[PDB]
C-alpha cells in the first residue's frame, strides 16, 4: 500500500490503498517540553502558570482542575464568592473553546467565514480575561484558595451586554452549517463510535455524549457550585461527527444559560480563603501587621507546605475530562504531577475511528475530537 | 448604527432576523473606563476575639490514610448506590 | 437533565415529502446560506485603524517590567530578592551590597525578557512596589541581545513610564 | 502561631549599639532571649553583655561604648534567633535559599573545625560552623569565619 | 460549619471502606493492602502478577463495573528496592465512583500489558516506557512516543538531570542539525526551600 | 552623578566601567552604553532632615498603602540622625 | 409492553425477548459458579447477587417496571452486564484468586512519605 | 508460590549500560552519601532526617555578555533522597558511580538542670539572668 | 496591510515561529527555511521561540529558534498581544524599507 | 474623539510629521505616543 | 529466592546471545539501504564499523535480563531507521562530526581545565 509521511505539530504516517485509509499512525512529541518534570522544581504556586499552557484554548479551566486538587490535599475550602467567579469564567472559557473547536473544524474543511465572525466574539471575551487578570490568555487567575483578585467594578454589566447578543451569533453559525448539505455530507456517519468502544478506549466528554452515554462530571461529580445552576446535557444518537458537532453547538447555548445565573446569584464576600498560611494577605495589611508581613514573606519564597498524600482530581473541561494525579511528600514542592489530557486518549483512537474512510475524512475526525497538542504532548 | 434605513432593511431581510437590535459592535452600553474606587469586604476570620487559629486550621485536620486491610452471611456491597436515571428536560426535550 | 440533539422523525406525508424534494432540486437551504453572507457584506466591519487606533486595555495589563522610585528620587527596591524567589521562569538575577551611604541596594538587577512569561508574580511579591509590569507592549527588537535587560535599562523604563504607571497603580491598588 | 494581628498600638523602637566591625546590631529586632548574654559569659568568658533597664524598656547591650572583640565573638550571630545580631561582612549579599552548601574542613588552625561553605553562582558568600561533638561542637573562631 | 475547612463526607468514607474489604476478600492471592484517604479515595495495592486478574474483575463484575480507565502512570522512588510504582485510575459510570490500583516493578522486571482489559492502555504504557523505562510484556506496539528519535535515557527518572545531556544546534559546515554536550549560558539555580521545622505532626514517622 | 573614565566611557551608579584594555568594550562601537542619569544616592541626600518632637517616629514612605512597610525609628542619639531603612528619609528630635 | 425502537446507545441493539435471555444467562452463571470452591468469596457473593437479580426477572412481567427494580439502565445494558459476569466467572476458575497471597511486599514498599 | 516461572541470576546488579548516561559522567564522578548538617542559623532539626546523595562540584565561569554563571556539568543540581544509608549505597552501586559514605552525626544527650544556675559551691552558678 | 492569512512555504516571504521549538521539531523547521525562496525573513514570536521561555531549562526544548535559523525580529511576551505581533510585522516592513541592495551593488 | 463610533474606533491619533529630529511623514510608529496620552488612547481611563 | 527473578525473553545467557546475533545480522544487512535512502556521505564500510563499535561496548554484560533490554532498544532503534522515522540528522548523531577531539592523556587535560 502507498505510504505517506505527511508530517509538518502533528506527523501522520498513513498507508492508503487508493482512496481508503488502511492504517493511521500518529507520531506525536513535536510539542513535548517536559512540563511534568519541570513542575517538580517549582512550588505549588510557581507551577500554576504551567496549566494555562497545556490546553491553551481553555486556560482558566486547567487552573481550576489544579486548584481543586491542591485545595483537596490542603483540606481547605475556597470562599463562596470565589466559587461563583470560578464558574462564571469556567463557562466563558467553555465558549472560547467551543468557538475555536467548531470554527477551526469548519475552516479545515473549507468553510472559512464563520471563523472570522466568531473570533470577534473571542476578542471581546479576551477583554474579560484582561480586565480581571491583566493577561488576555494566560491569566493565572484561579489559584488554590480562590481567585487572585476581585472583579473590577462594571465588569458584570459588560458580561451581561455580551451574553445578551451571543445567542444570535450561534444562530448565524447554524445558518451556515447545520442544514447545509455539503456540511452534512462531510460529517454524517463519519467516525462512528459505539458506546462500548468509547468507554474502553478512554473517551470522555462529547466523545461519550455523542454516542448516547449519559455522563457529565458537572452533574454526577459536581465541583464548586455547579449543583446550584440549571443546565441540560446534550446527547447524541448516532455517535458521528455531525451529532458531536450538534452537542458542542448546543453546549454553547447551555453555557449562556449558566452565565445568566452566575450574574444574578453572585454573592458578596471575599475572593480567597481567609487563611493566611495558604492565601497571601492584603497588601494594605501586609504593610502594617507583623504576621501579615511574615506570611507574605514565606508564601512567596518557600510556599505553603501541603500534607503528604496523593489525589486524582478531575473536571469537565471543554475538551473532555481533565485531571491531575498530584502527589505530595509534605514539602512546598510537589513530588509527582501527572496530567490526564482528554485529547491523549482521543487521538489514540484515531486509527480505530478512521477504518474504512477516505483520507479527507481523517481531517474531519481529527477536528471532531478537538485535539490541542499542548495537552497531548505536555 | 449609522446604516441608512434602506440598507438596514436589506440586511434584515437577507438574514431573516432583526440585526439592529443585537448589534455585534459596542457603542455606549458599555461600562465607563473610569470607575469609582471600591471598598472590598473582609473574610470571616477578621475578628478580634474567639478567633484562635487552632480552631480553624484546615491543614492540621488532615490525617494519614486509614488501613482497612494489610498483609503485614456478609452481604454484597458496591462502591456506592447505583446512579439514578436522568430525566428529560421540560425546558426543551428535543432540539 | 438531558436533551436529544438529533432524534427527530421526519414526516412522510406528501406535502412534507414534496417540501424536501423542492429543497433537494431547487437548493433552498444553500441559497439561505448565501443570504447570511450577503447581510455581513452590508454590516460595518469591526476592523480598527492601527497604528492610529489601539485596542482597549485595562489598568491591570501586564507588559514591560520596570523599576520605580519614591517621590524623592530614591529607588524603591531594597534587594529583598522575593521577586527572584517567586519568578517561575527564573528570569531575574540580583546582586546586592551595602551602598556608600549604607543602604541595602542592588548592584545587579537583570530580567531576561526571553525567559520571562509575563505573569505578574514579581510585582505581587514585591513589598515596596518597586518591580512592576507597565502598560507598554510595543518593544520588539531586531536582535536577541536587546531583550536582556539590566538595572540601567529597567530604571530608564521606570523614569520613562512613571506618569502612566503611577496612575494605573492608583486605579487598582484597592483590589490588591 | 496565628496568621493575623489584632495589635492596634504603636511599636517599641530601640537605638543600636556598636560592638565592633564583626557583629552588626539592629536591636529593635531583639526578643530579649538572652542567648548572647549566656554565651558570652559561659562559652567565651567575657562578661560584657547584659540586660539594662526594666520591663518593656529592658535592653541588651554593653551600657557603654564597648567592643565585644573575642576569638569566639562571631558565634553570637548564629545563636541569636533573630536579625538583631548579623554578620557585618555578609550584610545584604545573599539570601539563605539561593546558597549552595558544601561541607568542608577548616585549615586556619590545627584543630580542624568542621565548617559549611556557602557558595552562590560560583562565589564564596560565607563560612558557617558544622556540628562535631569531638572537635568544635557548633562553634568556630572569628578567623575561621 | 467552619468557612475555611473542607467538609468531611463520612457516608462515602464508610461505603468505600466496605467495598475495599469486599475486593480484598475476593482476591487474597493478589491484594496486599487497602487504604482509604481522608478525602475519600480508595487505593488497592496488589502484587504485580495480578494486574490482569484484578483489573478484569473490576471491569466485569456486576458490583464493580469500572468500565473506564481514567489514567495510567508511574512514579519513581529511588529509595525502594522496586523504584517504580505503577498507578491505575479507574471510573465507574454505573455506581459513580473511582478507585486506584497500584503495583510495583524495577528497571529489569517486566509487567503484563493491560491492553486486553483496556484499549486505552496502549498509549499510556508507551509513555511509561518512554519516560521511565518500564517494559510492558505482550504490548502490541511498544516504542518511544514523546521523546525524540534516538533519545538516550528516560527523562522522568528522578536521577535524570533536568536539562538533559545533549542540546541541538545548526552547524553550517555539515548543513544539518547536530547534537552536542549541553552547556548553559546561565546555570539553573537550586533553591533549598524546605523549612527546618516540622509542618504536620499527624504524619510523623517513628524514629 | 555620572563621571567619565579617562578613556571616555561613563561610569554607572554601581561603579561599573570597562578598563582601557578590556576587549568587552567592542560591544559599544557604533552604539551606546545605557546609563541612568538619576543617581539615587545623590537624590536622597538633597532631602531635608525632618524635625520631630517625639522619641520615636514612624515612617511608611508616604501614600499609605502605596509606600513601604511601616517602621518605627528611635531618635535618642543626638550624634546622628534617624534614617529609614526603606526610603532613606531622615528624622531628628527637636533639641531633646 | 410495547417494544422500544432504540436503546439510545450506539452499537447496542434492541432485544425482543429480555426475560428469556436473562434467565438463560443467569442460570449459566450459577452453573459456572458450581465449579468454584464452596468457601471462595467470589462464589458466595456472585451467587447472592445473581439470585436476587434472577428473582426480580421471574417476578416482574413488565420490562419498564423490571428496569426500575434491577437499576441497571436499559434492559439491554443489564443483558450486556450478565454476559460480562459470565465471562469473568469462566476466567476466575483459571486464575484461582481465592488462594493465599503469592508473595509479601518488601519491608517499606507502601510507605509514604519515605 | 507465584505462577510465573523464575530464573536464577547470580550476578551483581549493574544497569550502567541501559540508563543512557554518557560514560563521561559515570567513571569520573564521585557521589557523596551523607545526612545534611543542621543549618547553624536555626534550631530546627527537620532537615537532618533523610540521607542525601550529591555529586562533586565542577567549574562555573562567567558569561561574557551578561556575567551570569555558566556551567558544563549536567549533574550540578542533582540531589537524591534516601530513607537509609543502605538504600543510598544500593542506588550508587547499580548505577556505577564511585561514592563516599559519611556516618550520621547525632548530637549526644546533654545533662540539663535549671537548679545548677544557683549552686552553692560549684562553678556553674551564673551571674546574670 | 497586504499580509495574507496563510501562504505555502514556497510562495512565502516571511516565516513566523509562534510557539515552542522542541528538539524533535528543529530539523523540520530548518528544512522549511532552506526551501523558502529568497528574499526570506524570520520573525520570532513569544518567549518560547526567542529564548525558550518557561521551558528554557528543559531537556527537549531548543533554547531559542535563533540557534537553528537566523532571526530578523523578536516579538516579546507570553504570548505577545495580537497588537504586539502586528507592531512587529510593521517593524519588519520598515526594516525592509531601509534595504539598499542596489545602492551597494552599484558601488562594487 | 468621536463617541458615535463603535468602541475601538472612537479615539485615534494623527501622528506628528517630525519627532526627535526624525522625518515621520511616512514612517509613523505606535511607540511615538507619550505615556500621559498612552493611557487615554488605550481606554485605560476616560480623562485626557 | 532473592536471586530468583522473572525473565524478559531469555532464561539464560545462551539464549540471549542468539538474540544478539540475530539483531547484528539485521543491522549488518540494513546499512547499504540506510546509506542509500538517507543519501549519507559516509561509506558502507564506515557504517558497518559503527555497528560493530556499538555492539562491542556492551560485550562484558553477564546478566541475561540486561542483554534482553539492550536487544529491545536495538530493535526499536532499528525499526526507526528502516521505516525512515529518523532523519539524516538522527542517523549521523552516532558519529559526532561537529565535536572537536577531546584529549585522553593527563597532560593535555591539565593544560585546558580542571576535569579529571
Ligand atoms: C452601486 C451601488 C450604489 C453605489 C452608491 C453607494 C451609496 O450611495 O451608498 C449610500 C448609502 C450608504 O450606505 P450605508 O449602508 O448606509 O453605510 C454608510 C453610512 O450610512 C454612512 O457612512 P458615512 O457617514 O461614513 O459616509 C461618509 C462617506 C460618504 O459616503 C459615500 O461615499 C457613499 C457613496 C459612495 C458612492 O465618506 C467617504 O468615506 C467617501 C469615500 C468614498 C469612497 C467610495 C467612492 C465610490 C465612488 C465610485 C468609485 C469611483 C472611482 O447606501 C445606500 O443607500 C445604497 C442604496 C442605493 C444603492
Ligand atoms: C433600488 C435601490 C435603492 C434605492 C433607495 C430605495 C428607497 C430607500 C428608502 O428609503 O426606502 C427603502 C425601504 C425602507 O423602508 P422600511 O425599512 O420598510 O421602513 C423602516 C422605517 N424605519 O426599503 C423597502 O422596504 C423597499 C423594498 C420593499
Ligand atoms: C399533487 C398534489 C396532491 C398530492 O400530492 O396528493 C396528496 C395526497 C394526500 O397526502 P397524504 O395523506 O400524505 O397521502 C400520501 C400517503 N401515501 O397524497 C397522496 O396520497 C397522493 C398520491 C401519493 C403518490 C403520489 C406520488 C407523487 C410523486 C410522483 C413523482 C412526481 C414527479 C413530478 C415531476 C417532478 C419534477 C418537477
Ligand atoms: S512577569 Fe513573571 S516570569 Fe516575568 S519577570 Fe515577572 S515574575 Fe518573572
Ligand atoms: S521584590 Fe521588589 S524590593 Fe525585593 S528584590 Fe524584587 S524588586 Fe527589589
Ligand atoms: S541572642 Fe539575639 S534575641 Fe537573644 S537577647 Fe541576644 S540580641 Fe536579643
Ligand atoms: S526575618 Fe525574622 S528577625 Fe528579621 S524582621 Fe523578619 S521576623 Fe524579625
Ligand atoms: S504563549 Fe507563552 S508559553 Fe505559549 S508558546 Fe507562546 S511564549 Fe510559549
Ligand atoms: K541572628
Ligand atoms: Zn520610610
Swiss-Prot record, chain C:
The keyword Ion transport does not apply. GO terms for biological process: mitochondrial electron transport, NADH to ubiquinone; mitochondrial respiratory chain complex I assembly. [4Fe-4S] cluster 2 binds at residues 87, 116, 119, 122. Residues 68-97, 107-136 form the 4Fe-4S ferredoxin-type domain. Binds 2 [4Fe-4S] clusters per subunit. Belongs to the complex I 23 kDa subunit family. Core subunit of the mitochondrial membrane respiratory chain NADH dehydrogenase (Complex I) which catalyzes electron transfer from NADH through the respiratory chain, using ubiquinone as an electron acceptor. Essential for the catalytic activity and assembly of complex I. Core subunit of respiratory chain NADH dehydrogenase (Complex I) which is composed of 45 different subunits. This is a component of the iron-sulfur (IP) fragment of the enzyme. Interacts with RAB5IF. This is NADH dehydrogenase [ubiquinone] iron-sulfur protein 8, mitochondrial. The chain holds residues 37 to 212 of 212 of the full protein.
Swiss-Prot record, chain F:
It is found in: Mitochondrion inner membrane. Belongs to the complex I NDUFS6 subunit family. It comes from Bos taurus. One of its GO terms (biological process) is mitochondrial electron transport, NADH to ubiquinone. It is a peripheral membrane protein. Keywords: Electron transport, Membrane, Mitochondrion, Mitochondrion inner membrane, Respiratory chain, Transit peptide, Transport. The keyword Mitochondrion applies. Its main location: mitochondrion. Accessory subunit of the mitochondrial membrane respiratory chain NADH dehydrogenase (Complex I), that is believed not to be involved in catalysis. Complex I functions in the transfer of electrons from NADH to the respiratory chain. The immediate electron acceptor for the enzyme is believed to be ubiquinone. One of its GO terms (cellular component) is mitochondrial inner membrane. Mammalian complex I is composed of 45 different subunits. This is a component of the iron-sulfur (IP) fragment of the enzyme. The keyword Mitochondrion applies. This is NADH dehydrogenase [ubiquinone] iron-sulfur protein 6, mitochondrial.
Swiss-Prot record, chain G:
The keyword Membrane applies. The modification N6-acetyllysine is found at residues 28, 44, 58, 96. The modification N6-succinyllysine is found at residue 96. GO terms for cellular component: mitochondrial inner membrane; mitochondrion; respiratory chain complex I. It holds the Pfam family ETC_C1_NDUFA5. GO terms for biological process: respiratory electron transport chain. It is found in: Mitochondrion inner membrane. InterPro entries: NDUFA5. Keywords: Acetylation, Electron transport, Membrane, Mitochondrion, Mitochondrion inner membrane, Phosphoprotein, Respiratory chain, Transport. It comes from the Eukaryota. It is a peripheral membrane protein. The modification Phosphoserine is found at residue 87. Accessory subunit of the mitochondrial membrane respiratory chain NADH dehydrogenase (Complex I), that is believed not to be involved in catalysis. Complex I functions in the transfer of electrons from NADH to the respiratory chain. The immediate electron acceptor for the enzyme is believed to be ubiquinone. Belongs to the complex I NDUFA5 subunit family. Complex I is composed of 45 different subunits. This is NADH dehydrogenase [ubiquinone] 1 alpha subcomplex subunit 5.
From Swiss-Prot, chain K:
The keyword Membrane applies. Keywords: Acetylation, Electron transport, Membrane, Mitochondrion, Mitochondrion inner membrane, Respiratory chain, Transport. It is found in: Mitochondrion inner membrane. Its main location: mitochondrion. It is a peripheral membrane protein. GO terms for biological process: mitochondrial respiratory chain complex I assembly. Mammalian complex I is composed of 45 different subunits. Accessory subunit of the mitochondrial membrane respiratory chain NADH dehydrogenase (Complex I), that is believed to be not involved in catalysis. Required for proper complex I assembly. Complex I functions in the transfer of electrons from NADH to the respiratory chain. The immediate electron acceptor for the enzyme is believed to be ubiquinone. This is NADH dehydrogenase [ubiquinone] 1 alpha subcomplex subunit 6.
Amino acid at each position: 500500500n502507498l505510504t505517506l509521511n505527511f508530517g509538518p505539530v502533528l506527523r501522520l504516517v498513513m498507508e492508503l490503498s487508493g482512496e481508503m485509509v488502511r492504517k493511521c499512525d500518529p507520531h506525536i512529541g513535536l510539542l513535548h517540553r517536559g512540563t511534568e518534570k519541570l513542575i517538580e522544581y517549582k512550588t505549588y504556586l510557581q507551577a500554576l502558570p504551567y496549566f494555562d499552557r497545556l490546553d491553551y484554548v481553555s486556560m482558566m479551566c486547567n487552573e481550576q482542575a489544579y486548584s481543586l486538587a491542591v485545595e483537596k490535599l490542603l483540606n481547605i475550602r475556597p470562599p463562596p464568592r470565589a466559587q461563583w467567579i470560578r464558574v462564571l469564567f469556567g463557562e466563558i472559557t467553555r465558549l472560547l473553546n467551543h468557538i475555536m473547536a467548531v470554527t477551526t473544524h469548519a475552516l479545515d474543511i473549507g468553510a472559512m467565514t464563520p471563523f472570522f465572525w466568531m473570533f470577534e466574539e473571542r476578542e471581546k471575551m479576551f477583554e474579560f480575561y484582561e480586565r480581571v487578570s491583566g493577561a488576555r490568555m494566560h491569566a493565572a487567575y484561579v489559584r488554590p484558595g480562590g481567585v487572585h483578585q476581585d472583579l473590577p467594578l462594571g465588569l458584570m454589566d459588560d458580561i451581561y451586554e455580551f451574553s445578551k447578543n451571543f445567542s444570535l451569533r450561534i444562530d448565524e453559525l447554524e445558518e451556515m452549517l447545520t442544514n447545509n448539505r455539503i456540511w452534512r455530507n462531510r460529517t454524517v456517519d463519519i467516525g462512528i463510535v459505539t458506546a462500548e468502544d468509547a468507554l474502553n478506549y478512554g473517551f470522555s466528554g462529547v466523545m461519550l455524549r455523542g454516542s448516547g452515554i449519559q455522563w457529565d462530571l458537572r452533574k454526577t461529580q459536581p465541583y464548586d457550585v455547579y449543583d446550584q445552576v440549571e443546565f441540560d446535557v446534550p446527547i447524541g444518537s448516532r455517535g458521528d461527527c455531525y451529532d458531536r458537532y450538534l452537542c458542542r453547538v448546543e453546549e454553547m447555548r447551555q453555557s449562556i444559560r449558566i452565565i445568566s445565573q452566575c450574574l444574578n446569584k453572585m454573592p458578596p464576600g471575599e475572593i480567597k480563603v481567609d487563611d493566611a498560611k495558604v492565601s497571601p494577605p492584603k497588601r494594605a495589611e501586609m504593610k502594617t501587621s507583623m504576621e501579615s508581613l511574615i506570611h507574605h514573606f514565606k508564601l512567596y519564597t518557600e510556599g505553603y507546605q501541603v500534607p503528604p498524600g496523593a489525589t486524582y482530581t478531575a473536571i469537565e473541561a471543554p475538551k473532555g475530562e481533565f485531571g491531575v494525579y498530584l502527589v505530595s511528600d509534605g514539602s512546598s514542592r510537589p513530588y509527582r504531577c501527572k496530567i490526564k489530557a482528554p485529547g491523549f486518549a482521543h487521538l489514540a483512537g484515531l486509527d480505530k475511528m478512521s477504518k474504512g474512510h477516505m483520507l479527507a475524512d481523517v481531517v474531519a475526525i481529527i477536528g471532531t475530537q478537538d485535539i490541542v497538542f499542548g495537552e497531548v504532548d505536555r | 448604527a449609522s446604516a441608512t434605513r434602506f440598507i438596514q432593511w436589506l440586511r434584515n431581510w437577507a438574514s431573516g432576523r432583526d440585526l439592529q437590535a443585537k448589534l455585534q459592535l459596542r457603542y455606549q452600553e458599555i461600562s465607563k473606563r473610569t470607575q469609582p474606587p471600591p471598598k472590598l469586604p473582609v473574610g470571616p476570620s477578621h475578628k478580634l476575639s474567639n478567633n484562635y487559629y487552632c480552631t480553624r486550621d484546615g491543614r492540621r485536620e488532615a490525617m494519614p490514610p486509614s488501613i482497612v486491610m494489610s498483609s503485614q452471611e456478609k452481604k454484597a456491597v458496591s462502591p456506592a448506590p447505583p446512579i439514578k436515571r436522568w430525566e428529560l428536560s421540560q425546558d426543551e426535550p428535543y432540539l | 437533565t438531558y436533551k436529544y440533539v438529533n432524534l427527530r422523525e421526519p414526516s412522510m406525508d406528501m406535502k412534507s415529502v414534496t417540501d424536501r424534494a423542492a429543497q433537494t432540486l431547487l437548493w433552498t437551504e444553500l441559497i439561505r446560506g448565501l443570504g447570511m453572507t450577503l447581510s455581513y457584506l452590508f454590516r460595518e466591519p469591526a476592523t480598527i485603524n492601527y497604528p492610529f487606533e489601539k485596542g482597549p486595555l485595562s489598568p491591570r495589563f501586564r507588559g514591560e517590567h520596570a523599576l520605580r522610585r519614591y517621590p524623592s528620587g530614591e529607588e524603591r527596591c531594597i534587594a529583598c530578592k522575593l521577586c527572584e524567589a517567586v519568578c517561575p521562569a527564573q528570569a531575574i538575577t540580583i546582586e546586592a551590597e551595602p551602598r556608600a551611604d549604607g543602604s541595602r541596594r542592588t548592584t545587579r538587577y537583570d530580567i531576561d525578557m526571553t525567559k520571562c512569561i509575563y505573569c505578574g508574580f514579581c510585582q505581587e511579591a514585591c513589598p515596596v512596589d518597586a518591580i512592576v509590569e507597565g502598560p507598554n507592549f510595543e518593544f520588539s527588537t531586531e536582535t536577541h541581545e536587546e531583550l536582556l535587560y539590566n538595572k540601567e535599562k529597567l530604571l530608564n523604563n521606570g523614569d520613562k513610564w512613571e506618569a502612566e504607571i503611577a496612575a494605573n497603580i492608583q486605579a487598582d491598588y484597592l483590589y490588591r | 502561631g496565628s496568621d493575623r494581628s489584632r495589635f492596634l498600638e504603636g511599636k517599641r523602637a530601640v537605638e543600636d549599639k556598636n560592638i565592633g566591625p564583626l557583629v552588626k546590631t539592629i536591636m529593635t529586632r531583639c526578643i530579649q532571649c538572652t542567648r548572647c548574654i549566656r554565651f558570652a559569659s559561659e562559652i567565651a568568658g567575657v562578661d560584657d553583655l547584659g540586660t539594662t533597664g526594666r520591663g518593656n524598656d529592658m535592653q541588651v547591650g554593653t551600657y557603654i561604648e564597648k567592643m565585644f572583640m573575642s576569638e569566639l565573638s562571631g558565634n553570637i550571630i548564629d545563636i541569636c534567633p533573630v536579625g538583631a545580631l548579623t554578620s557585618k561582612p555578609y550584610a545584604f549579599t545573599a539570601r539563605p535559599w539561593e546558597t549552595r552548601k558544601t561541607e568542608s574542613i577548616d585549615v586556619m588552625d590545627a584543630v580542624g573545625s568542621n565548617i559549611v561553605v556557602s557558595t552562590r553562582t560560583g562565589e564564596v558568600m560565607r563560612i558557617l560552623p558544622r556540628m562535631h561533638e569531638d572537635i568544635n561542637e557548633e562553634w568556630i573562631s572569628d578567623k575561621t569565619r | 460549619t467552619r468557612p475555611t475547612v473542607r467538609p468531611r463526607n463520612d457516608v462515602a468514607h464508610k461505603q468505600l471502606s466496605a467495598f475495599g474489604e469486599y475486593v480484598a476478600e475476593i482476591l487474597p492471592k493478589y491484594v496486599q493492602q487497602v487504604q482509604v484517604s481522608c478525602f475519600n479515595e480508595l487505593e488497592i495495592c496488589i502484587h504485580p502478577d495480578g494486574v490482569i486478574p484484578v483489573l478484569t474483575f473490576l471491569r466485569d463484575h456486576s458490583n464493580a463495573q469500572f468500565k473506564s480507565l481514567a489514567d495510567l502512570t508511574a512514579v519513581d522512588i529511588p529509595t525502594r528496592q522496586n523504584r517504580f510504582e505503577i498507578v491505575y485510575n479507574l471510573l465507574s459510570l454505573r455506581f459513580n465512583s473511582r478507585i486506584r490500583v497500584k503495583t510495583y516493578t524495577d528497571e529489569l522486571t517486566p509487567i503484563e500489558s493491560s491492553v486486553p482489559v483496556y484499549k486505552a492502555a496502549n498509549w499510556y504504557e508507551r509513555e511509561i516506557w518512554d519516560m521511565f523505562g518500564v517494559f510492558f510484556a505482550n504490548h502490541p506496539d511498544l516504542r518511544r512516543i514523546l521523546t525524540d528519535y534516538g533519545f538516550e535515557g528516560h527523562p522522568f527518572r528522578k536521577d535524570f538531570p533536568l536539562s538533559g545531556y545533549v542540546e541541538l544546534r545548526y552547524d553550517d559546515e555539515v548543513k544539518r542539525v547536530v547534537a552536542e554536550p549541553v552547556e548553559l549560558a546561565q546555570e539553573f539555580r537550586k533553591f533549598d526551600l524546605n523549612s527546618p521545622w516540622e509542618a504536620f505532626p499527624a504524619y510523623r514517622q517513628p524514629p | 552623578g555620572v563621571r567619565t573614565s579617562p578613556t571616555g566611557e561613563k561610569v554607572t551608579h554601581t561603579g561599573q566601567v570597562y578598563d582601557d584594555g578590556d576587549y568587552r568594550k567592542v560591544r559599544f562601537v557604533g552604539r551606546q552604553k545605557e546609563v541612568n542619569e538619576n543617581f539615587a544616592i545623590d537624590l536622597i541626600a538633597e532631602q531635608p532632615v525632618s524635625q520631630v518632637g517625639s522619641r520615636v517616629i514612624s515612617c511608611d514612605g508616604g501614600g499609605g498603602a502605596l509606600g513601604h512597610p511601616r517602621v518605627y525609628i528611635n531618635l535618642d542619639k543626638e550624634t546622628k540622625t534617624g534614617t529609614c531603612g526603606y526610603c532613606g528619609l531622615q528624622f531628628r528630635q527637636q533639641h531633646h | 409492553g410495547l417494544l422500544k425502537k432504540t436503546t439510545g446507545l450506539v452499537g447496542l441493539a434492541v432485544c425482543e425477548t429480555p426475560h428469556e435471555r436473562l434467565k438463560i444467562l443467569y442460570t449459566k452463571i450459577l452453573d459456572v459458579l458450581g465449579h468454584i470452591p464452596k468457601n471462595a468469596a467470589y462464589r458466595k457473593y456472585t451467587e447472592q447477587i445473581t439470585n436476587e437479580k434472577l428473582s426480580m426477572v421471574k417476578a416482574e412481567p413488565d420490562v419498564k417496571k423490571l428496569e426500575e427494580r434491577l437499576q441497571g439502565g436499559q434492559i439491554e445494558e443489564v443483558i450486556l452486564q450478565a454476559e460480562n459476569e459470565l465471562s469473568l466467572a469462566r476466567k476466575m476458575i483459571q486464575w484461582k484468586p481465592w488462594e493465599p497471597l503469592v508473595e509479601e511486599p518488601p519491608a517499606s514498599q507502601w510507605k509514604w512519605p519515605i | 508460590t507465584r505462577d510465573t516461572q523464575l530464573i536464577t541470576v547470580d550476578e551483581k546488579l549493574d544497569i550502567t549500560t541501559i540508563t543512557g548516561v554518557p560514560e563521561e559522567h559515570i567513571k569520573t564522578r564521585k557521589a557523596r552519601i551523607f545526612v545534611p548538617a543542621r543549618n547553624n542559623m536555626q534550631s530546627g532539626v527537620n532537615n537532618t532526617k533523610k540521607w542525601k546523595m550529591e555529586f562533586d562540584t565542577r567549574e562555573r565561569w562567567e558569561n561574557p555578555l551578561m556575567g551570569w554563571a555558566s556551567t558544563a556539568d549536567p549533574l550540578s543540581n542533582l540531589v537524591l533522597t534516601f530513607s537509609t544509608k543502605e538504600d543510598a549505597v544500593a542506588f550508587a552501586e547499580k548505577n556505577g558511580w564511585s561514592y563516599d559514605v559519611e556516618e550520621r552525626k547525632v548530637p549526644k544527650p546533654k545533662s540539663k538542670s535549671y537548679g545548677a544556675n544557683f549552686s552553692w559551691n560549684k562553678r556553674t552558678r551564673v551571674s546574670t539572668k | 496591510f497586504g499580509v495574507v492569512f496563510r501562504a505555502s512555504p514556497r510562495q512565502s516571504d516571511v516565516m513566523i515561529v509562534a510557539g515552542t521549538l522542541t528538539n524533535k521539531m528543529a530539523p523540520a523547521l530548518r528544512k522549511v527555511y532552506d526551501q523558502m525562496p529568497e528574499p526570506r525573513y524570520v520573525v520570532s514570536m513569544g518567549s518560547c521561540a526567542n529564548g525558550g521561555g518557561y521551558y528554557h531549562y528543559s531537556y527537549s526544548v531548543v533554547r531559542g529558534c535563533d540557534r537553528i535559523v537566523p532571526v530578523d525580529i523578536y516579538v516579546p511576551g507570553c504570548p505577545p498581544t495580537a497588537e504586539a505581533l502586528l507592531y512587529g510585522i510593521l517593524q519588519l516592513q520598515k526594516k525592509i524599507k531601509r534595504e539598499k541592495r542596489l545602492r551597494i551593488w552599484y558601488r562594487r | 474623539e468621536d463617541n458615535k463610533q463603535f468602541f475601538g474606533r472612537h479615539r485615534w491619533v494623527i501622528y506628528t510629521t517630525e519627532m526627535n529630529g526624525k522625518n515621520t511623514f511616512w514612517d509613523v510608529d505606535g511607540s511615538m505616543v507619550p505615556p500621559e496620552w498612552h493611557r487615554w488612547l488605550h481606554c485605560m481611563t476616560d480623562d485626557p | 529466592a532473592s536471586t530468583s527473578v522473572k525473565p524478559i525473553f531469555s532464561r539464560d545467557m545462551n539464549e540471549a546471545k542468539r538474540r544478539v546475533r540475530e539483531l547484528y545480522r539485521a543491522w549488518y544487512r540494513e546499512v547499504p539501504n540506510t546509506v542509500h535512502l538517507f543519501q549519507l556521505d559516509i561509506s558502507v564500510k564506515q557504517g558497518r564499523d559503527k555497528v560493530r563499535e556499538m555492539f562491542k561496548k556492551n560485550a562484558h554484560i553477564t546478566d541475561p535480563r540486561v542483554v534482553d533490554l539492550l536487544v529491545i532498544k536495538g530493535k526499536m532503534e532499528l525499526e526507526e531507521t528502516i521505516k525512515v522515522w529518523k532523519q539524516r540528522t538522527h542517523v549521523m548523531r552516532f558519529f559526532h562530526e561537529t565535536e572537536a577531539p577531546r584529549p585522553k592523556d593527563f597532560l593535555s587535560k591539565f593544560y585546558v581545565g580542571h576535569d579529571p
